[PDB]
RNA sequence: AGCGCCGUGGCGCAGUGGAAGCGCGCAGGGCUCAUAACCCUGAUGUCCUCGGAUCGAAACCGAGCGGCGCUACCA
């Protein structure tokens with residue numbers, strides 16, 4: 122008897138329509154200021170709250186990708202040189218593909234915890250447990 | 256991982272499914288350029304190529320061994 | 333201003349905590365649903381079956397909350413060889429006012445005997461209907477022997493099907509056939525994906541699944557939509573487990589035994605060896621009650637080769653130091669549950685894959701190791717687990733003499749050589765030690781397409797005994 | 803979870819014990835009619851955060867961080 126099957130499926134669809142009326146896109150366009158010799162990104166903490174990441178880890182990765190380690194001020198990263206703005210758009214999109222969005226599911230709220238010595242990637246919608254720290 | 260790249264010229268990062276001296280023999284003829292198989296003190300594989308021919312070595316691994324063609328990064332330099 | 337841990341501790345003490353098992357309770361009265369048995373040990377084993385790249389550990393984790401490791405770096409992502417374990421407690425609301433579908437609530441191992449209901453508006457609590465063990469089984473085309481062993485251990489089935497891929501996937505059909513082989517009919521069909529689907533795609537997939545299960549052994553198998561990522565509609569699965577699946581006949585009359593499927597060594601590195609622990613054989617008890625401080629011998633045990641090529645079997649006697657079940661050390665063991673027997677067996681004997689499918693008997697029994705066995709085999713028509721590109725799913729041929737074929741006698745994974753071929757019976761020569769106690773359910777697989785492929789079922793009828801060397 | 807390595811000048815490599823290292827880069831200058839080649843000069847650092855013995859520590863030692871690599875999921 123498949124009668125008690127359709128009721129649960131309709132309940133699931135109603136739960137979806139309740140939770141997800143739109144069916145993630147909460148990633149703002151980066152704003153980098155080029156003062157001739159000084160490039161300032163005052164959007165690091167705003168994307169920290171728009172991606173649910175630890176800002177220290179964001180800054181450590183953004184240092185580890187380039188040959189630069191600027192200054193943290195406050196909610197903003199400071200570096201002194203000639204650099205573009207599209208580069209960190211690509212950096213953010215790749216970082217979203219690798220950490221901010223889980224490859225398995227479309228969710229942003231997922232984040233980095235420490236269950237050993239390394240960083241373990243965990244989710245918030247489900248709780249998927251993989252080792253994504255490199 | 257398995258990151259392959261070309262730096263102004265040299266190719267650093269080479270999977271070794273085929274022989275490196277065979278790599279020299281399949282590069283030297285078509286490219287007509289000098290190539291040196293140098294063993295640096297414990298980095299990846301080093302193969303030289305005189306004259307900037309980065310797109311040409313792109314064509315080359317397209318011909319011989321390239322199977323991913325996405326992690327190979329054309330450096331500015 | 334209570335810390336969350338303090339509030340949880342208050343709820344745990346309020347919920348009665350977890351009463352310790354009696355040291356010596358009356359067993360002629362104990363039932364699998366008794367309060368003392370149910371609080372700290374699982375009584376029914378539920379296994380999950382599905383196709384690759386679908387997600388079974390995720391559903392088990394969502395149901396219970398106990399994580400399934402997925403170890404060995406390379407296996408952290410693709411497929412696991414050893415089985416997955418997870419303890420869940422069936423808690424049902426005592427209040428009639430709240431709706432039946434969300435009355436049930438599955439909790440994890442160390443929860444109290446009565447937690448507070450999380451639904452808003454119900455001051456009631458939960459009562460423990462059953463403690464359930466979960467045995468996650470691999471569903472890849474390479475790893476079958478572990479899945480067959482765990483399905484032999486398995487008593488209740490959860491089939492997982494996702495919709496957006498092809499409706500007739502072969503792996504789930506193969507696992508269902510394997511379950512049908514070993515006397516198991518309580519199967520619950522679960523839809524993995526419902527959210528990303530349209531309201532008619534789901535109905536078409538359901539029609540396809542119903543069409544699929546019409547001529548197989550299981551007939552009245554319910555189908556339930558579930559989610560592995562969103563973590564919804566888990567209480568309905570709990571209700572279906574409570575309703576559809578009863579307790580298989582398992583009382584205290586039958587003799588004690590053990591079927592070890594995993595071997596665990598307890599050697600914490602970095603700590604001085606002055607304070608160590610014994611080696612653990614992870615085994616299922618389907619028949620018998622095991623108590624703390626018992627003498628037990630692994631029957632196939634030490635396999636060795638003499639200089640003449642003869643295979644010597646040395647049974648591994650050992651004293652039980654602990655019987656770890658569920659979350660806490662317990663005094664007595666319940667049949668129908670995967671328990672870790674931590675004995676004085678040398679830890680290197682439980683290192684990686686040594687006690688994977690080995691029969692073990694308590695002192696007071698004499699199992700029989702066999703070298704040559706007589707088997708009754710029954711075959712199927714089409715090979716399951718193969719996607720033929722439009723031409724007649726492969727027909728299984730008859731067996732030939734002297735072929736190494738994988739004869740999974742329950743948990744034992746052995747490659748036997750056929751010595752005799754007839755319509756129903758066959759003589760199997762075993763280079764690896766195998767043992768028989770009563771009947772043992774057996775699966776048969778051949779090598780036709782590289783990896784092992786199931787053909788049919790088998791039952792031992794006789795055998796050539798090897799007398800233990802004392 | 804431990805044990806075997808690392809802590810850059812854009813990078814690779816070195817001695818770590820009296821105080822910024824060599825080279826690959828970069829820029830500038832010299833050579834040449836000119837280019838290449840060759841030759842000279844630079845500016846890029848808490849050589850990872852915190853302490854100890856020491857007139858003095860980048861090192862000698864640690865009370866830990868960040869990443870590596872072997873065991874192997876280490877009830």
Ligand SMILES: Nc1nc2c(ncn2[C@@H]2O[C@H](COP(=O)(O)OP(=O)(O)CP(=O)(O)O)[C@@H](O)[C@H]2O)c(=O)[nH]1
Pocket residue numbers: 224225226249382383384385386387388389390391409410411412469470471472524525559560561
């Ligand atoms: N969209 C979606 N993804 C899911 C669902 N369930 C699981 N997944 C995905 O599956 C991944 C986990 O797969 P996993 O359980 O390891 O697969 P597996 O059980 O090892 C396959 P096999 O049993 O053959 O070994 C997660 O990263 C998750 O994103 C679901 O219901 N919906």
Ligand SMILES: [Mg+2]
Pocket residue numbers: 389400402411412413414415416468469470
């Ligand atoms: Mg697994």
Ligand SMILES: [Zn+2]
Pocket residue numbers: 223225226227228231244245246247249
């Ligand atoms: Zn996720």
